[PDB]
Design an enzyme around this catalytic site. Structure first.
Site, PDB file in Angstrom:
ATOM      1  CD  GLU A  11       3.438 -88.593  -6.306  1.00  0.00           C
ATOM      2  OE1 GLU A  11       3.683 -88.858  -7.460  1.00  0.00           O
ATOM      3  OE2 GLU A  11       3.584 -89.438  -5.324  1.00  0.00           O
ATOM      4  CG  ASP A  20       4.618 -94.803 -11.928  1.00  0.00           C
ATOM      5  OD1 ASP A  20       5.304 -95.619 -12.506  1.00  0.00           O
ATOM      6  OD2 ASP A  20       3.959 -95.145 -10.883  1.00  0.00           O
ATOM      7  CG  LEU A  32      -1.035 -97.322  -9.994  1.00  0.00           C
ATOM      8  CD1 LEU A  32       0.145 -97.319 -10.974  1.00  0.00           C
ATOM      9  CD2 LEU A  32      -0.815 -98.399  -8.925  1.00  0.00           C
ATOM     10  CG  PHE A 104       0.095 -90.296  -1.868  1.00  0.00           C
ATOM     11  CD1 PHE A 104       0.722 -90.235  -3.106  1.00  0.00           C
ATOM     12  CD2 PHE A 104      -1.202 -89.795  -1.770  1.00  0.00           C
ATOM     13  CE1 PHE A 104       0.049 -89.710  -4.208  1.00  0.00           C
ATOM     14  CE2 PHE A 104      -1.897 -89.265  -2.857  1.00  0.00           C
ATOM     15  CZ  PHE A 104      -1.260 -89.201  -4.087  1.00  0.00           C
ATOM     16  CB  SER A 117      12.973 -96.624   9.201  1.00  0.00           C
ATOM     17  OG  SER A 117      14.062 -96.886   8.345  1.00  0.00           O
ATOM     18  CG  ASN A 132      17.075 -98.380   8.859  1.00  0.00           C
ATOM     19  OD1 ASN A 132      15.929 -98.672   8.499  1.00  0.00           O
ATOM     20  ND2 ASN A 132      18.002 -99.318   9.006  1.00  0.00           N
TER      21      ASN A 132
END
Ligand SMILES: [Cl-]
Ligand SMILES: [Cl-]
Length: 162
Positions: A11, A20, A32, A104, A117, A132
């Protein structure tokens, strides 16, 4: 390597409000602020989150603080989710960090939707899960980061991060 370092790499760190990859107002280490297109709303959320009149800028300690709260919450969200928990409990430590990274990024809800998955991870079918996982908007929108997390699930090592 650990979850914190891993996410700090994915990040980055910015001390001033930025947009972002989806164009949403964020701050610090991928925190965020709001999905609204108003910088004011963003600034308001920021002030509220730090507890002071920020003017759109924070300090590094402030960013670190939000980061810890955010990592903590991702874990807690995982532990509280009926679909997520069983997977997380079945994984090794390296792989748990990859799951935390995804939550996250996309939230509990988002990740909880990767049913196929998730099942493959639970079964320890590494290669099949990686394939996948790659068939997703997530992969197509942020492929470098997605590649790193995927490798991480595939190998159970931090190789993608060194
Ligand atoms: Cl907050
Ligand atoms: Cl990326």
């Amino acid at each position: 390597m650990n979850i914190f370092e891993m996410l700090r790499i994915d990040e980055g760190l910015r001390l001033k409000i930025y947009k972002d990859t989806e164009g949403y107002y964020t701050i610090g280490i991928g925190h965020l602020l709001t999905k609204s297109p108003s910088l004011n709303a963003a600034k308001s959320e920021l002030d509220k989150a730090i507890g002071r009149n920020t003017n759109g800028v924070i300090t590094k300690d402030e960013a670190e603080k939000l980061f810890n709260q955010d990592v903590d919450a991702a874990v807690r969200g995982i532990l509280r989710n009926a679909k997520l928990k069983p997977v997380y409990d079945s994984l090794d430590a390296v792989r748990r960090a990859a799951l935390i990274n995804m939550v996250f990024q996309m939230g509990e809800t988002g990740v909880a939707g990767f049913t196929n998955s998730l099942r493959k991870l639970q079964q320890k079918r590494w290669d099949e899960a990686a394939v996948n996982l790659a068939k997703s908007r997530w992969y197509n929108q942020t492929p470098n980061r997605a590649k790193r997390v995927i490798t991480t699930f595939r190998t159970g090592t931090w190789d993608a991060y060194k």
